[PDB]
Design a protein around this ligand. Structure first.
Ligand SMILES: CCCCCCCCCCCCCCCCCC(=O)OC[C@H](COP(=O)([O-])OCC(O)COP(=O)([O-])OC[C@@H](COC(=O)CCCCCCCCCCCCCCCCC)OC(=O)CCCCCCCCCCCCCCCCC)OC(=O)CCCCCCCCCCCCCCCCC
Ligand SMILES: CCCCCCCCCCCCCCCCCC(=O)OC[C@H](COP(=O)([O-])OCC[N+](C)(C)C)OC(=O)CCCCCCCCCCCCCCCCC
Lengths: 55, 74
């Protein structure tokens, strides 16, 4: 009752391990929670045979 | 009814080149307005040239049919 928590488990005692899958998971969850129509839209792209000029 | 048939045929043969020059031109203009890159433009130049040749072909056809339709014996 002294702490602002819903349960007694405050999480792991070690940081996560770098993982492409976990990153994608977190990003998808954030996108779903935001629900913003306009993410990923590209109004102008440098004209090139390469799909992503530069990056 | 023969007069109506004849006038229909004559008008179609007379407007054929106008169509080839106007509506296909509008299509080409749409393509020009939408295209930006260089490869597609290189490929579309040949379509434009083909439209030139097709217009001349339609004009020849119309000339033939019109000299057939405006030929009188007497
Ligand atoms: C007469 C002189 C000679 C004329 C010919 C010279 C041109 C030769 C090239 C021809 C090839 C063209 C390609 C056609 C396919 C479609 C692609 C395309 O065209 O897009 C390119 C570009 C548009 O690209 P974009 O829209 O951004 O889209 C995709 C990107 O282009 C591309 O996508 P990206 O961004 O991802 O690519 C990035 C990267 C990709 O490329 C690279 O990464 C590297 C490329 C370099 C390769 C180097 C060679 C490799 C050598 C290996 C061997 C080494 C050892 C051996 C050699 C040792 C050397 C000693 O960089 C490039 O893109 C390089 C493109 C270079 C464009 C050409 C530059 C020349 C402009 C015209 C100069 C005119 C001079 C005056 C003419 C005078 C006439 C009176 O458009 C043009 O380049 C137009 C070319 C027009 C040529 C005109 C020729 C003259 C005709 C005169 C007509 C009269 C009216 C003209 C008005 C003025 C009248 C006075
Ligand atoms: C029994 C009779 C039979 C009759 C048959 C009739 C069928 C053929 C009718 C087609 C007539 C089409 C001509 C009008 C379209 C061109 C308008 C024009 O001149 O634009 C201004 C042109 C182009 O101008 P421009 O594009 O440089 O810039 C100004 C253009 N304006 C003003 C429109 C903005 O003026 C010129 O300088 C042209 C000079 C070059 C010569 C071009 C003429 C040849 C191309 C047309 C041939 C069509 C006849 C083919 C017949 C084949 C028969 C075998």
């Amino acid at each position: 009752h002294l702490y602002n928590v819903d349960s007694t488990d405050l999480g792991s005692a070690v940081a996560p391990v770098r993982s492409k899958e976990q990153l994608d998971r977190v990003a998808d969850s954030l996108k779903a929670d935001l629900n913003l129509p306009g993410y990923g839209h590209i109004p102008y792209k440098w004209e090139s045979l390469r799909p992503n000029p530069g990056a | 009814r023969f007069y109506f048939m004849y006038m229909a045929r004559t008008t179609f043969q007379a407007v054929r080149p106008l169509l080839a020059f106007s509506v296909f031109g509008e299509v080409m203009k749409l393509v020009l307005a939408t295209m930006s890159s260089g490869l597609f433009s290189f490929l579309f130049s040949f379509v434009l040239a083909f439209e030139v040749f097709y217009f001349f072909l339609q004009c020849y056809i119309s000339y033939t049919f019109l000299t057939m339709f405006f030929t009188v014996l007497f």
